[PDB]
Design a protein around this ligand. Structure first.
Ligand SMILES: [Cl-]
Ligand SMILES: [Cl-]
Ligand SMILES: [Zn+2]
Ligand SMILES: [Zn+2]
Lengths: 144, 144
């Protein structure tokens, strides 16, 4: 569909990540009934851990809850197209679908049982783009 | 992935439909192991039946094989983006994924558990576009 309520929630969460120095990305994992089982934000720089993107964080939350590395029954929704580290972690726990809102400007993948699917929600996409733009502006100001 | 072998097969089949007066569309339904369970071509005008597009034909083949209207365990691959009649029939048998090669130039859908996903296979897409173009050229020649 367009996940308007889940996206409202994720966009609200990611603000937290932006306040603390990380690209404001939030994401959740859902079961087939679209219930959220785990939610996480990006905390790579905040916790000085190369792996702590929102996607790997949410994967680890669910591994913890279910005591299992097999998430084949679940789908992932993120505000921003995942990097390749996260894409590979998502693949390695057998999640078959990644919904993302905003693709990443910054590989050639012929994987399957793994679809990367852009959510169409223009209002939410424009809102999240404005949040990211504010983050990057502050990024270049501190860069200089 | 890019379904290169299945697409080779479908593009070969659809030629049959083009020879007999129908837009040359072919499609199959696959299980989770990507095995084909049913394959069909468009035969609307050939059999004077508004419903006999390739997608509805393949659905009926599988309903027949399984004696069930519940195809929730299966995915559909077609050469051409489905019309809305077929999209609704696919939804009504609970198939969750439609892979298509070529989108249709000729609605606003907020359905979910139903993803419409364009296959990326440039060589196969260009080949199928050339086949369709030949079909339409002959169409306008007979039109006049
Ligand atoms: Cl890998
Ligand atoms: Cl309906
Ligand atoms: Zn990442
Ligand atoms: Zn149709």
């Amino acid at each position: 569909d367009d996940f308007n309520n889940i996206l409202d929630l994720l966009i609200n969460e990611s603000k937290k990540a932006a306040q603390l120095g990380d690209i404001p990305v939030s994401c959740c994992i859902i079961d087939s009934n679209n219930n959220i089982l785990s939610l996480a934000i990006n905390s790579r720089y905040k916790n000085k851990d190369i792996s702590q993107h929102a996607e790997i964080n949410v994967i680890n939350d669910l591994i913890s809850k279910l005591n299992s590395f097999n998430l084949s029954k679940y789908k992932l929704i993120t505000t921003l197209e995942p990097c390749m580290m996260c894409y590979s972690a998502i693949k390695q726990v057998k999640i078959n679908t990644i919904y993302y809102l905003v693709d990443d400007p910054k590989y050639s993948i012929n994987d399957q049982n793994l679809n990367l699917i852009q959510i169409k929600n223009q209002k939410k996409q424009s809102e999240y783009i404005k949040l990211l733009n504010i983050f990057f502006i502050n990024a270049r100001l501190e860069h200089h």
